[PDB]
Amino acid sequence: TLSILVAHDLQRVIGFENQLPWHLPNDLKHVKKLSTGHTLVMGRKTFESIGKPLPNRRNVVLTSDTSFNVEGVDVIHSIEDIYQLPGHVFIFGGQTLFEEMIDKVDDMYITVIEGKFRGDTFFPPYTFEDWEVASSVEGKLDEKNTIPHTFLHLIRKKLVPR
Ligand SMILES: NC(=O)c1ccc[n+]([C@@H]2O[C@H](COP(=O)([O-])OP(=O)(O)OC[C@H]3O[C@@H](n4cnc5c(N)ncnc54)[C@H](OP(=O)(O)O)[C@@H]3O)[C@@H](O)[C@H]2O)c1
Numbered sequence: 001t002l003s004i005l006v007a008h009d010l011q012r013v014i015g016f017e018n019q020l021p022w023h024l025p026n027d028l029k030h031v032k033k034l035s036t037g038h039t040l041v042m043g044r045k046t047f048e049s050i051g052k053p054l055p056n057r058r059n060v061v062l063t064s065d066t067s068f069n070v071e072g073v074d075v076i077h078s079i080e081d082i083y084q085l086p087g088h089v090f091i092f093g094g095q096t097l098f099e100e101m102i103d104k105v106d107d108m109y110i111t112v113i114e115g116k117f118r119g120d121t122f123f124p125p126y127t128f129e130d131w132e133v134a135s136s137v138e139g140k141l142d143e144k145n146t147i148p149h150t151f152l153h154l155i156r157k158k159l160v161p162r
């Protein structure tokens with residue numbers, strides 16, 4: 001199974017200056033719950049933003065740099081290598097990988113950040129015409145988690161004749 005895992009705002013912003021535009025602990029918890037025990041594929045810039053591999057899961061980084069080697073990170077040099085990875089693979093970011101993979105994935109785990117942030121990187125446009133909402137769950141707000149957010153699990157719709 002190949003899935004997208006992403007948080008994007010009302011305008012599909014996902015990043016600003018190589019960081020998340022928002023501070024939202026609940027969403028990183030969401031990420032931890034979904035991806036622990038599985039595989040993350042991410043582009044080089046996303047990896048450098050985080051700075052180190054996320055524990056208790058396989059970290060795969062896509063880059064054209066053959067000098068790339070990081071302790072605890074598997075490196076690939078092409079999209080095609082993604083399909084050789086076993087188990088549940090989450091496309092983790094950033095904009096470039098999402099653009100490259102959105103027409104290829106089975107489903108998407110999207111956190112809609114219900115706000116408008118300054119961004120310089122975006123998730124590609126998509127329509128609920130093409131994606132079934134398997135689930136939609138409002139995130140709970142508190143003192144530390146003040147931005148409204150909704151967890152979507154979207155599954156690609158089958159094209160059929162009507
Ligand atoms: N859910 C979210 O909100 C979320 C998730 C992840 C990231 N982000 C954000 O997204 C932003 C970064 O996105 P980005 O598009 O600038 O960077 P990115 O996709 O993380 O990384 C781009 C790099 O990935 C490598 N790459 C991509 N496609 C490749 C291919 N086909 N073959 C070989 N290498 C390939 C290249 O590395 P080399 O140049 O080293 O070859 C490329 O420069 C950051 O602001 C980050 O905060 C947000």
Ligand SMILES: COc1cc2c(cc1OC)[C@H](C1CC1)N(C(=O)/C=C/c1cc(Cc3cnc(N)nc3N)cc(OC)c1OC)N=C2
Nearest residue numbers: 005006007019020027028031049050052053055092093111
């Ligand atoms: C080596 O030790 C640790 C290092 C770390 C951590 C824990 C450790 O040990 C427990 C925490 C962990 C959560 C505790 N951590 C993160 O979660 C980072 C999350 C993160 C994710 C994304 C992708 C992403 C976010 N959202 C959703 N919806 N989809 C996605 N595809 C992007 C980021 O930046 C550009 C991130 O960076 C902010 N950062 C380092």
